[PDB]
Write a protein that binds this ligand. Structure first.
Ligand SMILES: *[B]([O])([O])[C][N]S(=O)(=O)C1=[C][C]=C(C2=NN=N[N]2)N=[C]1
Length: 358
């Protein structure tokens, strides 16, 4: 690889791994559109399996970028509109608080205080309907952002209803397959289990647990190669041959709401480039990222801005992921680790690498 990339990646990631005690890590840098890969450590400590370019990591909430693009693709297909009431696709949602809550609100965490997590007690479909029927908003729709699996996860489930496909089938046929993400999974098949890293939480090997709306909110697993290809696809949607998927990618990077210096897309979040690094670094800390914040509507949404830092953090109990890219520079990074280590350390490392290469 070019020495500049080798040097800034190793000089940034080596200390990160040591400071954070990360058992295994994979990184891809996309530079002038081409990927360069780096790996360290162990996918499975007990079995002494190294991280490789074929290792599967849990993406956690980086999955929301796939959900947002799949929803964008459904909009481009004419199957749904973000202006549609949630009740168009779920007529059983008859409780009055749902009046005026649209798919846009669900997609962008602005419905009025849907919670981060669906309760673990929700195990059945009827439990899930009860949960949404009984939920009471703290705020009018379109006034406050509260990051939430229960919001964008319901968006993903409703977005695929007109297609008649399951969420997984829709994601496979409409997103994974056309983009040649052939080692990206909502459910890891038995044939791929040899590549599935263990996550590590307090020293214990763990994988993500089943939950309501898991696939839609936090349930994708992928390799560093496929994630590099996901970044390439989001960097340059105009190269994507499938028209609705190209359009869906563009829709997911539109700017729908502003809070502080950040703009909410569908799954993706964006800031103007050049960014103040303290603003994305500090902004990534869950003390800010998970907080309830007033939003300003962008009326109408701004189309995808090329001069953007576009990014998403993700975590499960055992894994920590981060993706960021700048379309105008054809530059991006993916960092996948099998420990959930603090967001700001991820973003700091990503910014150091990308800033040096820009
Ligand atoms: B995303 O920002 O990564 C979602 N984060 S989360 O705190 O809501 C979350 C959901 C599920 C899990 C999980 N780990 N193992 N099983 N489930 N972890 C975090």
């Amino acid at each position: 690889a070019p020495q500049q990339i080798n040097d800034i990646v190793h000089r940034t990631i080596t200390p990160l791994i040591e400071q954070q005690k990360i058992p295994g890590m994979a990184v891809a840098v996309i530079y002038q559109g081409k990927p360069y890969y780096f790996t360290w450590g162990y996918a499975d400590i007990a079995k002494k399996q190294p991280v490789t370019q074929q290792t599967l990591f849990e993406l956690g909430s980086v999955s929301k970028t796939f959900t947002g693009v799949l929803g964008g693709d459904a909009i481009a297909r004419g199957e749904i509109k973000l202006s549609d009431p949630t009740t168009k696709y779920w007529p059983e949602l008859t409780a009055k608080q749902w009046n005026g809550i649209t798919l846009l609100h669900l997609a962008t965490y602005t419905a009025g205080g849907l919670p981060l997590q669906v309760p673990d007690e929700v195990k059945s479909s009827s439990d899930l309907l009860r949960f949404y029927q009984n939920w009471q908003p703290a705020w009018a729709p379109g006034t406050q952002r509260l990051y939430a699996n229960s919001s964008i996860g319901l968006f993903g489930a409703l977005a695929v209803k007109p297609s008649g496909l399951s969420f997984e089938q829709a994601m496979q046929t409409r997103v994974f397959q056309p983009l040649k993400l052939n080692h990206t999974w909502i459910n890891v098949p038995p044939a791929e289990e040899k590549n599935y890293a263990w996550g590590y939480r307090e020293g214990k090997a763990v994988h993500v647990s089943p939950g309501a709306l898991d696939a839609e909110a936090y349930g994708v697993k992928s390799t560093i190669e496929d994630m590099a290809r996901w970044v390439q696809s989001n960097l340059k949607p105009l190269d994507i041959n499938e028209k609705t998927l190209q359009q869906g990618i563009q829709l997911a990077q539109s700017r729908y709401w502003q809070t502080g210096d950040m703009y909410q897309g569908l799954g993706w979040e964006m800031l103007d480039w050049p960014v103040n690094p303290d603003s994305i670094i500090n902004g990534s800390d869950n003390k800010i990222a998970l907080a309830a914040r007033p939003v300003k509507a962008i009326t109408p949404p701004t189309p995808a801005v090329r001069a953007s830092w576009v990014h998403k953090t993700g975590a499960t109990g055992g894994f920590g992921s981060y993706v960021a890219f700048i379309p105008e520079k054809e530059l991006g990074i993916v960092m996948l680790a099998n420990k959930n280590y603090p967001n700001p350390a991820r973003v700091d490392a990503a910014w150091q690498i990308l800033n040096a290469l820009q």
